[PDB]
Amino acid sequence: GPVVSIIRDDLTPQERERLMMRVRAALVDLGVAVGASVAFRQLTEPMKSEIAATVKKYLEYDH
């Protein structure tokens, strides 16, 4: 029953690639914004640490 599989099946290769491409695009955009900030010397070390900790919290990366 193909129709049941359409509702039930885990993410397809194309769907998984789409989700990961959104992560990649956000990472590129963050590098662009941070690259400009760092060039204008706008991020102190505590500010860098807070950005890094925010991202680790998003990732549920417990380090």
Place this chain on the structure above:
Amino acid sequence: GPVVSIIRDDLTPQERERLMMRVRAALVDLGVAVGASVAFRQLTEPMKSEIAATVKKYLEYDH
């Protein structure tokens, strides 16, 4: 000499806020993309570590 100051002076409060708002916007977008990925269980621990390391490299955050 106001005209000279317009070329020479360091970033104004408004310019600094604009640069930092772009960082914030990219951080929100990354949280949105990562939030969706983590919900679909798409990020393994090594993939999380690589994303975190990429951001630290952008930040020139040597930890």
Place this chain on the structure above:
Amino acid sequence: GPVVSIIRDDLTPQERERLMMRVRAALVDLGVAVGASVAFRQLTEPMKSEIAATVKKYLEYDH
């Protein structure tokens, strides 16, 4: 013959798959949006219940 069947016949496998793919695509998009919301801690328990009840109402799922 054939021309009458083209108007009268029930949905073909291809047409049924197209309809169910649109349901799947909307479910993925809802998981993406909800995944981001839940990551930013934006949905309280009553809000979750209201979203679930909305979907059950769409489905005509009387539970």
Place this chain on the structure above:
Amino acid sequence: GPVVSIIRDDLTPQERERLMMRVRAALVDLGVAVGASVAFRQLTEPMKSEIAATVKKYLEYDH
């Protein structure tokens, strides 16, 4: 002052509204797709239950 707050502060009203609008838009799209499916009598009771359970799982709604 301000620049630190731009990195640190919790989501603003505008940002919260944008996140919730994406949930609303996905819910409308799911109602559109399900509305078409139900009209063509394409969802059995078990299929409805599976869609509802998928959404509750997204929501982390433990009912």
